[PDB]
Amino acid sequence: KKISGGSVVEMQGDEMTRIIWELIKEKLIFPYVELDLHSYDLGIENRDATNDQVTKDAAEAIKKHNVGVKCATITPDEKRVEEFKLKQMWKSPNGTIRNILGGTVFREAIICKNIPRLVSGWVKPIIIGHHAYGDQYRATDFVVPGPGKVEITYTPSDGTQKVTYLVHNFEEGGGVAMGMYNQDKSIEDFAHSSFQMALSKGWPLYLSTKNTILKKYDGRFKDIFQEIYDKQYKSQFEAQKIWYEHRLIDDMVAQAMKSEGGFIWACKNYDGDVQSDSVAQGYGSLGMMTSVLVCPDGKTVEAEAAHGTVTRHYRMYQKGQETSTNPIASIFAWTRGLAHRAKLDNNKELAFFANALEEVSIETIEAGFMTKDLAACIKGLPNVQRSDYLNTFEFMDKLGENLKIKLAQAKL
């Protein structure tokens, strides 16, 4: 009776998300789906015990099977190290997994017709693709104490004459100086990932750069994106009635606000980092934002919620108090992974189920059963009442009932 799932790699998470994650699998997924499951505990204690070995093993497994579903994880910081008595301040699991996999992360927010938005106009998804190999985020930056000259020099490994340029001469006073770089392969991968995501998504693609100011530096991003599109992707875009274009960031943010959504926006690392929160904020609650990591090959996908472990809610949970935490992003992480898995294996039965969960989840909210954060959006935070929303367990049950009804209705 159960659908045959295929092979998926599952990673367990931390805190509030973890409680939901088990609930989602137990009620939402396992009953109707059978999977070959490779399960890794990415929970902070396990990561600590394994030395972060488990995280690496999990990342490798995703490469082997091509599909990953992930739960939000604690990212170690000094307070955390003190809290868990961690052996070391471990690197973020997302950071490690992205590093091993390569590929680019795209964040999109689920939209419900009843829920209001900061930007009312945005009735279609806007998807942000983030280039996380950073010009800014891998940068050499320093204070300039006193008058001096700052120069940037490139030395060819081939023994060709080295080139030096004077960034500035500080005749008087202090300054701040910086050096940053980007590499052709990362940009190339990023472009390949974005074209493929758009083609898979069904939406048009834009890339934003301040290429007018920084003709050489941002020109490479623009040039690489054009070169790849023309050579390998354009006809497919033509067939699917969608396009790729390059936009200046000032134009794009303004255009995006005016716009009704429905596009994939490809962002350089600084732009993407700013964009990811802002776009989510415009849409609504963080509970409704999902992250998908997509590699250049297009075979491999890792899906996780955009939001974190939701510690503030979890603390209430520990205290024995009631919580209303949104599972939609976490639920959607599963559905997206399943859909890709269905896509790779050409499994319609799985594909149908992954969609069915998404429809059910939206339909339930659209009918007025929702977590507190959603309720706040319609009411306003002050005006929300306990009757207005379901608690975390209550919402999942309503979702479970609906999922059962929906699937049965489909049969026949």
Ligand X SMILES: NC(=O)C1=CN([C@@H]2O[C@H](COP(=O)(O)OP(=O)(O)OC[C@H]3O[C@@H](n4cnc5c(N)ncnc54)[C@H](OP(=O)(O)O)[C@@H]3O)[C@@H](O)[C@H]2O)C=CC1
Q: Which of 37, 49, 178, 257 binds ligand 9UO (CB under 6 A)?
A: 257
Contact 332, 287 (CB under 8 A): no
Comparing CB distances to ligand 9UO, the nearer of 32 and 217 is 217
CB of 253 to ligand 9UO, least distance (A): 4
- Binding to a second copy (CB under 8 A) within 271-310 occurs at 273-274, 276-278, 281-282
* Under rule CB under 6 A, residue 136 binds ligand 9UO: no
Q: Which stretch binds ligand 9UO (CB under 6 A): 106-114, 274-282, 291-299, 392-400?
A: 274-282
E strand or H helix at 384: none
Comparing CB distances to ligand X, the nearer of 75 and 240 is 75
Q: Which of 9, 199, 279, 354 binds ligand 9UO (CB under 6 A)?
A: 279
| CB proximity list for 174: less than 8 A, separation 6 or greater | 143, 144, 145, 146
How far apart (Å, rounded) are the C-alpha atoms in residues 196 and 200? 6
User: Which residue's CB comes closest to ligand 9UO?
Assistant: 278
* Under rule CB under 6 A, residue 132 binds ligand 9UO: no
From the list 54, 12, 1, the residue with the least C-alpha distance to 333 is 12
Comparing CB distances to ligand 9UO, the nearer of 8 and 187 is 187
Q: Which of 249, 288, 357, 377 binds ligand 9UO (CB under 6 A)?
A: 249
Comparing CB distances to ligand X, the nearer of 47 and 307 is 307
* Under rule CB under 8 A, residue 227 binds a second copy: no
CB of 125 to Mg ion, least distance (A): 8
Partner whose footprint covers residue 239, from ligand 9UO, a second copy, ligand X, none (CB < 5 to 8 Å by kind) = none
Partner whose footprint covers residue 26, from a second copy, ligand 9UO, ligand X, none (CB < 5 to 8 Å by kind) = none
* Under rule CB under 8 A, residue 412 binds a second copy: no
How far apart (Å, rounded) are the C-alpha atoms in residues 10 and 8? 6
CB of 70 to ligand X, least distance (A): 7
How far apart (Å, rounded) are the C-alpha atoms in residues 48 and 74? 11
| CB proximity list for 288: less than 8 A, separation 6 or greater | 109, 110, 111, 112, 280, 326, 328, 329, 374
Cβ-based neighbour number of residue 164 at 10 Å: 10
DSSP codes joined into one string, 280-329: HHHHS-GGGEEEEEE-TTSS-EEEEESS---HHHHHHHHHT-------HH
How far apart (Å, rounded) are the C-alpha atoms in residues 227 and 122? 31
Residues near ligand 9UO (CB under 6 A) are: 119, 249, 253, 256-257, 271, 274-275, 278-279, 282
